[PDB]
Structures are given as structure tokens and as C-alpha cells.
């Protein structure tokens, strides 16, 4: 939290079965 | 501290020029719609010199009772820039002849 450095219009949807992520979001 | 320094010198310059304009006491017949206008004018001048980014003139109000005025206002400060982070990824692709 101190100041530091370190090193189109048509929206699209996808829905299907895969592993990971919260259910129903 | 630097935000406080900028504030201290802004309010001092504001406090000073309000002396000449109104606290010179010349009459009560300069009402509160003129004081609102004067603070808008002066915020314009400091906006011209970029010391404040912009001001909502609609959200400025003045109330006057006897020989005392009460004023509310809002200022957008020159917004600072705290942090950067860079994701650097190495890749390879062939040179050919």
C-alpha cells in the first residue's frame, strides 16, 4: 500500500461444464 | 504532507481574497448569490492554473444571517498516482534462413 512498482461492442456469452469456479455465478 | 501544503496555500489565498471582496465590510447589500458567484469565479481561476481539476458549481450553497455567511462547497483534487505492476513473460520463437 506504500507507493511502489514491481515486475468490441457485441458482448459474448459462454455457458457449459468444466472444473472450477463458484456455482451459479 | 504535500496534500496538506497544497491545501494550506489554497485556503490561505482564498481566505485572503475574501477579505478584500466582502470582509472589507462596505455594505450588507451584497447578498449571498454574489458570494456564491465570487467563489465560482475564483475556482475558475484556480482551475485555469490546473491546481484543482474541476468543481461542481451546482453543489455550492450559501446561507446568511445578520453579518455572517455560511458556505458549503466541493473540490476535485489533482488525483495522485500510487502504484504500478508489470507482468513480464518470456517467450521464444525461431529465427530462420
Amino acid at each position: 500500500t506504500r507507493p511502489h512498482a514491481s515486475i468490441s461492442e457485441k458482448v459474448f456469452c459462454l455457458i457449459g461444464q468444466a472444473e472450477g469456479g463458484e456455482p451459479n455465478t | 504532507m504535500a496534500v496538506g501544503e497544497a491545501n494550506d496555500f489554497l485556503v490561505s489565498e482564498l481566505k485572503v481574497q475574501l477579505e478584500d471582496q466582502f470582509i472589507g465590510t462596505r455594505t450588507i447589500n451584497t447578498s449571498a448569490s454574489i458570494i456564491k458567484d465570487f467563489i465560482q469565479s475564483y475556482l475558475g481561476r484556480k482551475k485555469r492554473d490546473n491546481e484543482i481539476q474541476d468543481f461542481p458549481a451546482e453543489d455550492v450553497q450559501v446561507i446568511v444571517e445578520g453579518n455572517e455567511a455560511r458556505i458549503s462547497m466541493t473540490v476535485y483534487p489533482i488525483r495522485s498516482f500510487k502504484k504500478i505492476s508489470v507482468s513480464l513473460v518470456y517467450k521464444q520463437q525461431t529465427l530462420q534462413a
Binding site: - | 471582496q21 466582502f22 448569490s33 465560482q40 469565479s41 451546482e58
Partner: protein, 139 residues
């Protein structure tokens, strides 16, 4: 009819103000403003596709009777000779009398040209033209 209920402003109700002090015996005030608008023409068509605002130009003229004292030269809002280079930017406001309420405001006027007149048997009159940074109204 009465001042509180008329729907149109008149020279009878308005008061002109400058640096927080009223103007004495103003005869008129005109404000001319231009936006230098220009139409975007093309080959292949005869009428401009759209207009664009190029520049802000502001003018105001005030006509006043020459007060015996406290005219523009005496009061310091205007000055003769060398002295104009010493003078600050000045704010002029229009204000309805009954409520002391700002109608418009000429933020930061500065003089352009100054015209005076004396005549036989007749009133001495003045005129000053200013230019200004911006004009705005609120409340």
C-alpha cells in the same frame, strides 16, 4: 404587472454591479458573443455534414452618464494613459434588485476601448467596451 409576478425582465428591475458595488446611472448594457461556428463541407455533397465550434469570442459594452465623482476613471475600474497596465481583471454581474440575485455574470472583464462625449446644453455621457474570460450564470 407587479414586480414579483411579471414574466419578463426589464431595465426597471435589473441592477448592474461591478467588483461588489453597484453601477451609477447606467444607460445600457449590451453583450455580444460568438462561437465562430463553421460547416464541415465535402466533395460529393452540397450541404455541410455537421457544424463545429471553433473559437470563443466575448464582447460587452456599457453606456453610462458621467457622474461628477466616482466614474470609471475615478473609481479605478478604468483608467487613462499609462495606468491601464497596472489594473487587475474585473468582474461584472447582472442582478435583479428585489432579491439581489445574480442573473448572469461576465467573469473577469478587461477593457478594450473607451468613448466619451461632451455637447452644448446636454448631458455628458461615457461608454466603455470590455472583453472577458468567460460568462456564466448559476442560481
Amino acid at each position: 404587472a407587479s414586480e414579483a409576478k411579471q414574466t419578463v425582465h426589464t431595465g426597471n428591475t435589473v441592477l448592474l454591479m461591478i467588483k461588489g458595488k453597484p453601477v451609477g446611472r447606467a444607460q445600457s448594457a449590451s453583450g455580444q458573443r460568438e462561437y465562430g461556428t463553421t460547416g464541415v463541407y465535402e466533395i460529393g455533397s452540397i450541404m455541410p455534414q455537421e457544424h463545429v465550434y471553433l473559437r470563443y469570442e466575448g464582447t460587452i459594452t456599457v453606456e453610462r452618464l458621467r457622474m461628477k465623482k466616482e466614474n470609471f476613471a475615478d473609481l479605478g475600474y478604468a483608467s487613462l494613459g499609462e495606468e491601464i497596465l497596472k489594473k487587475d481583471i474585473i468582474d461584472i454581474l447582472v442582478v435583479d434588485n428585489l432579491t439581489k440575485q445574480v442573473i448572469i455574470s461576465y467573469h473577469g472583464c478587461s477593457a478594450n476601448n473607451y468613448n466619451e462625449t461632451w455637447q452644448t446644453n446636454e448631458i455628458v455621457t461615457e461608454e466603455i467596451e470590455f472583453s472577458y474570460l468567460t460568462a456564466s450564470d448559476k442560481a
